[PDB]
Amino acid sequence: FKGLDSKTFLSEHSMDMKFTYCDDRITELIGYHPEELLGRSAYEFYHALDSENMTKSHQNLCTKGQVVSGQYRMLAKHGGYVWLETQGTVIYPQCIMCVNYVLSEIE
């Protein structure tokens, strides 16, 4: 069983969703080292079945300034996916600041 703090990680993105920062909690959860995400679009990591929903969430984030993503699956480093939800906020546009919380174990 994991505490609340331990299932959350912060990330920062340019407006095209490319990672510009990720906190190290992601390693313990999903396997990635932050340095290996940098410059990659978050879209590369969404499950195919969530791509249209996440495109819509990104559009809402950019037009409203904030969004809660709803549940989606992020591809884990060593295979499989984790369920997540993300609260996104645009910093003014300068960048996107995401609070990502894991909803499941790796599947």
At residue 92, the 3 state secondary structure works out as coil
Cβ pair 14, 95 in contact under 8 A: yes
Q: From ligand 0XB, another protein, none, which one binds at residue 32 (CB under 5 to 8 Å depending on kind)?
A: none
CB of 46 to ligand 0XB, least distance (A): 6
> Which residues contact ligand 0XB by CB under 6 A?
11, 13, 17, 42, 45-46, 54, 57-58, 61, 67, 69, 74, 86, 88, 96, 98, 100
83 binds another protein (CB under 8 A): no
Cβ pair 52, 67 in contact under 8 A: no
Q: From ligand 0XB, another protein, none, which one binds at residue 17 (CB under 5 to 8 Å depending on kind)?
A: ligand 0XB
What torsion do the CA atoms of 78, 67, 96, 14 make, to the nearest 10 degrees? Answer: 70
